[PDB]
């Protein structure tokens, strides 16, 4: 055929000036595995631009899934590549392909790659992609004018959805919105319009376009009370009745209730969570080699929380889930958690007990604070139904006595998992740390210290954990004078070590 063939590493070893000097053609691309694709030069230019970490390692194999158009596969029959659809260029798709190119080098050699070098190669490849797409692409600038509005407004399928429509929620959200949502998703209708091509590329949202090109439906008051008669017009053809515009003006009234008590209480929640979460630290790579494997039930809703987690299968040693298993949806699988493994460090854990999330954490990074941080950013993004009630519920569960004191923490983890993951997307490796931070050995002897076997699982209150352990960390929380006049703090017990201990004593080494 009249299709030139290019190898995988031949386009990668090419210069940056010779990469853009490619002829306009359809071409075959061979890969390191036993597959080959067909592509346009304007897509493989971006593909090579996102293959920047593969340039430093000229010995790893490049699979066929690294290309944007991996659906096109050259077979013996032409029915699989004649009229097919490739991949859509998205701001998340380039990041996902860079992530694939990083983990291809990570699983090329056997589990010995420094992840900070790959994390620097990712941002270096993103910077090179930005510096190449800014300078070389200057003739192709997106624009917006009155013609771009009149091109999409004058469509008959959009104009049919605005006439003869009953003022009903079913008649607007299902009937009127469906007839325009079925034509926004059509890839053979609006070719060249910047608004539809930006909508399909994940930049413009479709929720903001149904309130402009279709009927705007039922704005609310300050309270959550809907109105009987909705507004007829949209935002292209504006609202010009007094009643409808007065209803529409109340839609922007709820965007100003930004009192300082909310920003005070979320900072108080972060200061309450991180100061008690900061006890566990300094995870170590390796294996502690314990047979004290805990057991947890896996459901459908918490399957994303068990993504990076090692479990024990039959006739096998260890395996990680990674989140593609439709099975194991109702059984009780034996896992490997931090509760009950033996490391020589008194406050550290291993990599296999924490899961596959530990390799994404840098070496000099506290694993204790980042669990509360990963909870708190999603909580603040839920803050910014009644997320303050969820925050007070998590405060009462984690940093109070509202939980029933169970005998073992293996039944406390799935309850907190099904309470958290139903509304806040949080991995269970953070919840394991947040539960393990409230664990104290030998509560009958006042030995306020973290036990290394988690099978004990003795929980107490949050204030007794703040006052009766590590006074240098107790000086950072409220009510500083109460640990001072306590008779239990004037006797040398073996206790833990807070990071604040150096700021209290000025910075003395001993």
């Amino acid at each position: 055929m009249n299709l030139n063939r290019y190898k995988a590493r031949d386009l990668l070893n090419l210069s940056y000036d010779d990469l853009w000097s490619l002829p306009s053609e359809w071409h075959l691309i061979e890969f390191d595995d036993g597959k080959t694709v067909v592509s346009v030069d304007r897509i493989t230019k971006l593909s090579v631009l996102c293959w920047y970490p593969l340039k430093h390692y000229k010995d790893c194999p490049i699979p066929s899934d690294h290309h944007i158009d991996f659906n096109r596969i050259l077979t013996d029959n032409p029915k699989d590549y004649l009229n097919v659809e490739g991949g859509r260029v998205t701001s998340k798709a380039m990041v996902k392909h860079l992530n694939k190119a990083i983990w291809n080098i990570y699983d090329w050699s056997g589990e010995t790659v420094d992840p900070e070098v790959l994390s620097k190669l990712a941002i270096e490849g993103k910077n090179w992609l930005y510096n190449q797409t800014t300078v070389k692409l200057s003739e192709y600038l997106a624009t917006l004018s009155m013609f771009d509005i009149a091109e999409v407004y004058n469509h008959p399928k959009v104009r049919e959805a605005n006439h003869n429509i009953e003022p009903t929620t079913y008649g607007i959200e299902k009937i009127s919105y469906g007839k325009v949502k079925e034509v926004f998703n059509d890839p053979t209708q609006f070719i060249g319009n910047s608004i539809i091509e930006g909508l399909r590329s994940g930049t413009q949202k479709t929720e903001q376009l149904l309130q402009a090109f279709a009927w705007r439906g039922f704005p609310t008051d300050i309270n959550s009370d809907i109105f009987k008669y909705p507004v007829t017009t949209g935002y292209i053809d504006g609202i010009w009745n007094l009643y409808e515009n007065m209803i529409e003006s109340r839609s922007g009234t709820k965007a100003l209730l930004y009192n300082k008590e909310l920003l005070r209480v979320t900072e108080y929640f972060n200061r309450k969570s991180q100061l008690i979460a900061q006890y566990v630290q300094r995870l170590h790579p390796g294996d502690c080699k314990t047979t004290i494997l805990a057991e947890y039930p896996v459901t459908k809703l918490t399957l994303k929380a068990f993504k990076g987690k090692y479990y024990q299968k039959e006739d096998g040693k260890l395996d990680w889930i990674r989140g593609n298993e439709t099975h194991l949806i109702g059984t009780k699988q034996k896992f490997r958690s931090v509760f009950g493994c033996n490391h020589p460090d008194s406050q550290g854990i291993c990599m296999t007990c924490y899961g596959r999330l530990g390799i994404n954490i840098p070496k000099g990074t506290n694993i204790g604070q980042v669990a509360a941080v990963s909870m708190g950013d999603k909580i603040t993004s839920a803050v910014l139904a009644e997320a303050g009630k969820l925050s007070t519920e998590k405060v009462g569960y984690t940093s109070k006595t509202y939980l029933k004191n169970y005998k073992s923490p293996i039944e406390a983890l799935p309850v907190f998992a099904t309470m958290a993951n139903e509304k806040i997307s949080l991995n269970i490796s953070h919840c394991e740390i947040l539960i393990y931070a409230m664990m104290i050995r030998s509560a009958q002897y006042r030995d306020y210290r973290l036990p290394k076997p988690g099978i004990n699982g003795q929980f107490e209150k949050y204030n007794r954990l703040m006052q009766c352990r590590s006074l240098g960390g107790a000086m950072a929380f409220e009510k500083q004078h109460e640990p001072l006049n306590n008779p239990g703090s004037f006797l040398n017990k073996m206790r833990n070590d807070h990071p604040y201990d150096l700021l209290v004593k000025g910075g003395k080494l001993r």
């Binding site: 067909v38 004649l82 260029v89 983990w103 994390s119 941002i123 930005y130 994404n360 980042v370 941080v373």
Partner: protein, 201 residues
């Protein structure tokens, strides 16, 4: 727990839409003339025959006035950093909850326009803190030593690339902005070639 540190600055932020690196900071003339005063005094007592009073008068006089000697001494002070791109500095956000709110950059260029009073930051680092151009003032500290600059490498723009939620996934702070993506959308997703039936016929 620390308050009111020295060798610091606080100013509003702009962006750099240029061919540049992911860790580059552009300090303006008025901020750089007062943040580097004893450095300019050392350079004026070394390269020129001036006392410290005349050097202090030359530093404080040319804060709101551009001249070539202070700009050349700024270019020399940037060029003195042999293993780094410039002077290592730390950059903070006032709501500091995540990792990206505290980063370390390098001063690479002092601006010549005296009316521009703003620190210009990289485009790709705009996503890791919640920092926009809505009249917000952001803080900056200057690391004096090489050991302190090596110890501040634990907070870097490359440290928050990997996500802290999913085990094998790069976080969404690496995603490009709107007008950066839209030109590639208009370029790649265009009716550029005839289809595969017409191409081989």
């Amino acid at each position: 727990f620390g308050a009111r540190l020295n060798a610091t600055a606080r100013a509003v932020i702009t962006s750099i839409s240029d061919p540049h690196d992911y860790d580059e900071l552009h300090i303006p003339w008025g901020v750089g003339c007062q943040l580097l005063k004893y450095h300019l005094t050392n350079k004026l007592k070394a390269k020129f025959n001036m006392t410290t009073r005349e050097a202090f008068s030359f530093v404080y006089e040319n804060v709101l006035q551009y001249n070539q000697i202070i700009a050349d001494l700024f270019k020399e002070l940037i060029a003195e950093a042999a293993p780094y791109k410039g002077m290592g500095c730390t950059f903070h956000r006032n709501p500091t909850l995540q990792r990206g709110s505290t980063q370390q950059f390098f001063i690479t260029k002092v601006k010549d326009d005296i009316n521009d009073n703003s620190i210009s930051m990289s485009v790709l680092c705009l996503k890791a803190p919640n920092a926009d151009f809505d009249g917000d003032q952001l803080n900056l500290t200057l690391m004096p030593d090489v050991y302190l600059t090596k110890a501040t490498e634990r907070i870097a723009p490359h440290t928050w690339v990997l996500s802290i939620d999913e085990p094998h996934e790069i976080s969404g702070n690496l995603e490009l902005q709107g007008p950066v993506v839209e030109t590639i959308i208009n370029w790649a997703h265009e009716k550029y070639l005839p289809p595969l039936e017409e191409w081989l016929k």
